[PDB]
């Protein structure tokens, strides 16, 4: 209600007056315009907040609101005489002086629109769903062991080694150079993918890709640091819809280039590098906010956290989030290896991983739309539902584990889509059962600790299973052990249920 709410109600009332006739009842509308103009005079804007008040560079702002309120006077003194046509020309003059005078001290009024175009355009990566067919094609032809037990373990250790140090640098740099560093990380990933020479180059590529998969929370933190808390809900919803639509558009564009357009994979990654340089340009065209999370103290956080240390439902959803998130990332990091294992077709257009990615993103958006609508009491039917979801995950991983048929893996693609139906169905519920108990800073802290423990569990399973000095096991026995792991989780949560 400092500057932006008065600006929004002034814009809404001006849009009402612009399409309204019969000016006897626009007097309430014009005096609400006057109230919104007079209330936004002592507002101290953030681009003026760094400068001292009562300055000669501030007098243009007050003179702009001076001529604004003066033309509101000129409108309403012609509206009180029973006239209906002078108010429209006065509103046009109000529009021109609002565009001229006030907008000098307003940086950018398409911030929601620019974040929507950033979610719809700068998330387009058509080579995302074809990384493993590019690594295992006629170009370089990595073997299955060198892509299973040597590349993605470095991805797991790098995700740990960029979640632990770089999270403070993410919170500290006010999130515009954080997204710039993420764009430069995408540039480094596709330059190491287009100029690969050995396996350690792809290890460095996953080292730079861990920053990209770890800086997804930084986008919503940028939204919370830019958009006010009196506007964060609707703009955050449209931004999440824009991100999901951008991922779906990326997967559909990958299917149109690879399958339909028959574009080669090197040219596919050329297109991906071009759109990621466009994403770097869009990250350069951002706006740096001020109110960061953990840098713009500790005793109040510990006092508010002490009531949420040993809660049973919070610990249940947190341990479920850690275990099922570790299982989710261990399925996603190897499911492309499985898809290139079962159907190793050398033709480029006969690879339908992007269609499975688009259907999985769509079903995840549907199940996220069908997660907050659960008006069911979570007293008794929680742990049995968790056991059923983990049993569904065990069944889908077991279906992915024993499939050795070329025509069935199609449905197994959809099974991975159904795996999102067994994962994204409870992710907004796991967000709602944590965010509704603490403050938003403590909410981000609890989700960071949960992601940290999920990374610990993933790192332990990576260090034990895929290491050649310990077990030394191929991907088939890894998927069998993952099916046994989800079955054991189903047994544990079923014994916890009843």
């Amino acid at each position, epitope marked *: 209600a400092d500057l932006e709410d008065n600006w929004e109600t002034l814009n809404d009332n001006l849009k009402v007056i612009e399409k309204a006739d019969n000016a006897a009842q626009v*007097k309430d509308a014009l*005096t609400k315009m006057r*109230a919104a103009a*007079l*209330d936004a005079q002592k507002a101290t804007p953030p681009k003026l907040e760094d400068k001292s008040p009562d300055s000669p560079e501030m007098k243009d702002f007050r003179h702009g609101f001076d001529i604004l*309120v003066g033309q509101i*006077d000129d409108a309403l*003194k012609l509206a*009180n005489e029973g006239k209906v046509k002078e108010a429209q020309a006065a509103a046009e003059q109000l529009k021109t002086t609002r565009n001229a005078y006030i907008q000098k001290y307003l940086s950018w009024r398409h911030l929601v629109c620019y974040l929507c175009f950033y979610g719809f355009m700068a998330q387009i990566r058509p080579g995302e769903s074809f990384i493993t067919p590019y690594l295992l094609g006629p170009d370089k032809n990595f073997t299955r062991e060198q892509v299973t037990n040597e590349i993605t373990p470095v991805l797991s250790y790098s995700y740990l080694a960029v979640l632990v140090p770089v999270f403070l640098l993410t919170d500290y740099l006010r999130y515009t150079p954080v997204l710039l560093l993420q764009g430069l990380s995408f540039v480094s990933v596709w330059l190491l993918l287009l100029l690969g020479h050995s396996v350690a180059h792809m290890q460095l590529m996953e080292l730079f890709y861990s920053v990209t998969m770890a800086a997804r929370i930084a986008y919503s933190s940028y939204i919370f640091s830019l958009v006010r808390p009196a506007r964060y809900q609707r703009v955050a919803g449209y931004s999440r819809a824009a991100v999901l639509l951008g991922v779906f558009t990326s997967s559909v564009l990958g299917q149109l280039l690879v399958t339909v357009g028959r574009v080669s994979f090197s040219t596919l990654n050329y297109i991906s590098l071009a759109f990621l340089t466009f994403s770097v340009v869009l990250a350069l065209f951002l706006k740096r906010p001020k109110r960061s999370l953990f840098f713009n103290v500790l005793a109040r956080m510990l006092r508010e956290l002490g009531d949420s240390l040993r809660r049973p439902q919070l610990r249940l959803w947190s341990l479920w989030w850690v275990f099922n998130s570790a299982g989710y990332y261990l399925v996603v990091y190897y499911v492309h290896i499985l898809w290139n294992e079962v159907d190793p077709t050398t033709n480029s257009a006969r690879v339908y991983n992007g269609a499975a990615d688009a259907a999985s993103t769509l079903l995840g958006a549907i199940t996220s739309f069908a997660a907050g609508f659960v008006k069911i009491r979570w007293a008794r039917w929680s742990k049995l539902l968790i056991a059923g979801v983990t049993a569904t995950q065990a069944g889908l991983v077991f279906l992915l584990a024993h499939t050795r048929h070329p025509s069935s893996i199609w449905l197994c693609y959809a099974a991975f889509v159904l795996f999102r139906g067994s994962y994204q169905f409870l992710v907004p519920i796991a967000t709602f059962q944590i965010a509704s108990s603490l403050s938003k800073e403590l909410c981000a802290l609890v989700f960071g600790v949960n992601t940290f423990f999920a990374t610990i569990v993933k790192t332990i399973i990576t260090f034990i299973v895929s290491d050649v000095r310990g077990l030394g096991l191929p991907v088939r026995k890894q998927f069998q052990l993952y099916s046994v792991y989800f079955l054991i989780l189903s047994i544990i949560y079923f014994l916890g249920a009843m």
Partner: antibody
Amino acid sequence: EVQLVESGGGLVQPGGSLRLSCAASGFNVVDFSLHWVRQAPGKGLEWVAYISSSSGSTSYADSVKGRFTISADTSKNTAYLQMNSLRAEDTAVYYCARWGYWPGEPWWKAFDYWGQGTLVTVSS
Amino acid sequence: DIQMTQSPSSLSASVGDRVTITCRASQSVSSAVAWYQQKPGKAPKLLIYSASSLYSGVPSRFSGSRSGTDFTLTISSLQPEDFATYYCQQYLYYSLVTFGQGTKVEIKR
């Protein structure tokens, strides 16, 4: 000093005509607008009408709309409030008040120099 | 047109008592309200303008505050001269002068 004075109030019949004169000793009406405020005996303050000699903005209150009229002159530096077809509700004290134009010191300062206030009564 | 309600319509205090007269608007009126002190029979006087400022002529024992659409007159040390009727009037436009109801303060007896 600058101040206000009112004249013309007295006894009228219900439905008659009466012309109040508001004079501003000191300032002129081209730099400040004039206002009329009704106060019934026992009741509270309430607004009637205003006039601005810079442009002309004779906009009235809904209880007195189309029944009163006002005309201000800057050569005599005064304002005539002519009232015809009155009712029994207008037995009240009318104050003529100064109030400034936008912006700054004239507008943000409220009705600062109230007048002495004339008194009108309605009785058959 | 709009209303301007003024709740403590009958207050009472002795010499040197802090009183708070509140006043609620109907619309989202900006920080331009007027607190007036009218003696019984005499003319009103501008006491507080723009909801926070002190007028040149009234003493320093008068102030006010804004909380959304709730304006507040505060008197710290109540002088025995200050037993009058205090009126609340939002000034937003020329033709939207809507006074309150008047709060005739009394002596604590």
